[PDB]
Structures are given as structure tokens and as C-alpha cells.
């Protein structure tokens, strides 16, 4: 399948070269998989989600996304126009308030929630979690991410936006999850992207168009935007049967475009997420 005039990041993940604008993908499109977006919520009524999104948990007085960040990330995973995996099921877990903030205790509870809740959901092709959040190093936060992964969920986490080594941030620094840095449309490391040996992969993160609250759209930047590209890619590949939750991060690294990014510090992987789709 081909989506013409797609957001640059979608085109990038199906291309061996920068500078193209069509996204190519197998029409299965992540059907039968599920992606949990652990964030500020998801505006599930957005036409872009087509009934495939639902809120399943909140830790606040409402499950509504009053911020937009979670809705944007969910759109990059799985919206019809802006999403990698256009037929996946999206589940919202609101661990962040409408200012985008959350206590580590709440974030941990949300991860443990997903590890169990996937057993209430029909996800025959597999389960992914997208975590576009983090703060300073916490062994308890890293442990929770490790448990979520161990339970059979492909965990993709943002490296962070400090232009610093991600070893000092959580859950970015948990080795067993998939830690995602950000790139721009010219194949440069995004100016704010964290780096370091803990990174597994880069995805598009600068100037990413996706869904927003109020039934709208906007372009924003962050490792928060790169992470759902990788989460959606994992769901897409799991639906194709090419990999599993336990092996998808390694598979994405194995099949990535290699050596094509600029300003990658020595010791950080030079790997850009790629779907290897051939029509
Ligand atoms: N995808 C590519 O063209 C490429 C270029 C250089 C090294 N590895 C891969």
C-alpha cells in the first residue's frame, strides 16, 4: 500500500533514502495487534482513530487528554493519516496530568497495569507499549519497564530531550526495553535528542505532524515523537509475523538503515527504524 504526501517521518521509515514523501506499507497495517500509549490520554473521539482507540485507565479525575501530547503520540502509532500501524488497536493509559506531569509512583502503576490489562484485550498478533515520558534515573521506574517487557509487551521508550547521555534518565536507561532517539528529515540527530550506548534505535522526531485534541492536528518535536514511530513499527511487524514482543527491538535494529545519520556521538548506534517493505 502507498500513502501519498505522507508526513515525512512515515515516508522515512519505509525508505532507504531521505527526501521522499510516500509511505509504503503492507495493507495488514498492524491489524490484530494492540498498542498502549502511556501518556496524557488519547482523544479517542478524534475522526483519525476511526473507533480503534479507547481509554482504559486514568489516575486522575478524568480520562480525557486535556494536553494533546498523548493524542499526538497515539496518532503517530495508529491514526489513519498520521500513523505507522493504521489498523492497530490503541489503548490509552493516563499517567500524566493535563500539564504533562506525573509522579513516578503513578507511572510505575500504569506500567504494571498494562502488563496485566493486556490479558483483558484481544491482541492475537501481539502487544506494544509506547512511553513518551521520563525523568531522572530511578531503579524502580526501570524495574517497572523491565517487568512490562518481561510480561510479553514490546516496550518502546523515549531517550529524552536533554542532548545528554540517556544512562541518567528513566525509563530510557533500562537495558531490556527499546530506547528511542530522534532524527530530523535530513537524517541528522535531532538537536535535543539524548544519546549513548543505551539507545537501541532512532526514529523521526523533529517536526512530526500528528493528531491533537479538539479534533485537530499539529507538528511538534521530541523523542516523544520518535518513540511512537518505533512502537507502531513493532506492531506492524508483529502483525506480519516477522517478530515478537520479546524480539522486536532486536529485529528493528537488525533491519534498520545503518550509518545514515549525522551527528551521532561515538559509541551511540547509527541505526534508523525501517520497515523493509517491498511491494
Ligand atoms: N540504506 C543505505 O543506503 C545505507 C547506506 C550506507 C550504509 N548502510 C546503508
From Swiss-Prot:
Disulfide bonds join 34-123, 178-249. One of its GO terms (cellular component) is extracellular region. GO terms for biological process: proteolysis. The active site is at 39 (charge relay system), 69 (charge relay system), 224 (charge relay system). Residues 7-279 form the Peptidase S8 domain. Its EC number is 3.4.21.64. It catalyses: Hydrolysis of keratin, and of other proteins with subtilisin-like specificity. Hydrolyzes peptide amides. Ca(2+) 2 binds at residues 16, 260. Binds 2 calcium ions per subunit. One of its GO terms (molecular function) is metal ion binding. Its cofactor is Ca(2+). Ca(2+) 1 binds at residues 175, 177, 200. Keywords: Calcium, Disulfide bond, Hydrolase, Metal-binding, Protease, Serine protease, Signal, Zymogen. Hydrolyzes keratin at aromatic and hydrophobic residues. Belongs to the peptidase S8 family. This is Proteinase K. The lineage of its organism: Eukaryota, Fungi, Dikarya, Ascomycota, Pezizomycotina. The gene is PROK. The chain holds residues 106 to 384 of 384 of the full protein.
